[PDB]
């Protein structure tokens, strides 16, 4: 939410 | 057995800023 | 983490964030122990007075990281779990006693100058270094009060059993120890909201390698005048971890 997105890789 | 060890630190024999703290208390 | 100050960069190469995948959020903190295994507590796992029970799907394990909210380009690494194991005994209907969980991961993680796994105690070193007033170390990304940009560090001096007893009504157990500053004392702090399963350690001045004693588990409030951290005490549930990871 507040956290930058994580490459969808994960 | 390489636990506990940081690089950035015991690796390079660089102690970190409060470390010390904790050795003064072990009395 | 309350009253605590940034951690330098590499500080604590063993600390884990938790994540959850949907929505993308905070859960806890957590240790790296090896390059396949990580620790934190069971509340961060199941909790059923707050309809808290995640399975492996629902998560991820977030390593070398410094900042809370930022994807750590080339330096964090981001692991999946492949199991998840509670302690049998885990009281979470009372008091938390022995608020345990390993976690392994799909894949092994590779060690670098922010990822290092951090040493668990064996009974000589419990010994030596759990006693009263002698401090140890406690990192998270919890709460400031009753959120940080970077990951928080404060050192905490280990509190007498019978002043642990007589600061709360719950039933303290000896898988449990506390930490904190008196009021007389005048310096604070605490672990907080957030920093659940985040670890409490301590560096030997026998073989100068870091060991993590506690993980954080719970606390009346945050940083509360007369009230105590407390966390599990590692090396009296030692004997489950090895049979699990054995
Ligand atoms: N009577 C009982 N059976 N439980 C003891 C309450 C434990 C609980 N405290 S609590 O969430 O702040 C709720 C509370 C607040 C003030 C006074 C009483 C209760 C607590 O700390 N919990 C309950 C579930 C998870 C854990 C937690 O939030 N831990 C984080 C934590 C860990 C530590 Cl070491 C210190 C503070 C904090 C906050
Ligand atoms: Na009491
Ligand atoms: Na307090």
Redesign the pocket.
């Known amino acids: 939410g507040d956290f930058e997105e994580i490459p969808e890789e994960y | 057995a390489d636990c506990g060890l940081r690089p950035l630190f015991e690796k390079k024999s660089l102690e970190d800023k409060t470390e010390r703290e904790l050795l003064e208390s072990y009395i | 983490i309350v009253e605590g100050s940034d951690a330098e960069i590499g500080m604590s190469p063993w600390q884990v964030m938790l994540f959850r995948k949907s929505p993308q959020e905070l859960l806890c903190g957590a240790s790296l122990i090896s390059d396949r295994w990580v620790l934190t ?1 069971a ?1 961060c796992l199941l ?1 059923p ?2 309809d808290k029970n995640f399975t492996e799907n629902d998560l991820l394990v977030r390593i070398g990281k410094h900042s809370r909210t930022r994807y750590e380009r080339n330096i964090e690494k981001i692991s999946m779990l492949e199991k998840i194991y509670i302690h049998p005994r885990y009281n979470w209907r ?3 006693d022995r608020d345990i969980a390993l976690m392994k991961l799909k894949k092994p993680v590779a060690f670098s100058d922010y990822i290092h796994p951090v040493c668990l105690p064996d009974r000589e070193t419990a010994a030596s270094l759990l006693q009263a007033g002698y401090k140890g170390r ?1 990192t998270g990304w ?2 400031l009060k ?1 959120q940080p940009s970077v990951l928080q560090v404060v050192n905490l001096p280990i509190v007498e059993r019978p002043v642990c007893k007589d600061s ?3 039933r303290i157990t000896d898988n449990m120890f506390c ?1 904190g500053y008196k009021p007389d004392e005048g310096k604070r702090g ?7 399963g985040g670890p409490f350690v301590m560096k030997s001045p026998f073989n100068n390698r870091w060991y993590q004693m506690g993980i ?9 005048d007369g ?1 105590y ?3 599990t005490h590692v090396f009296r549930l030692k004997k489950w971890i090895q049979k699990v990871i054995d």
Do not use: M
């Open positions: 507590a509340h909790y007075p707050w009372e008091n938390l406690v919890g709460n009753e709360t009504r719950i930490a605490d672990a907080c909201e957030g920093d659940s954080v588990s719970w606390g009346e409030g945050c940083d509360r009230k951290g407390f966390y």
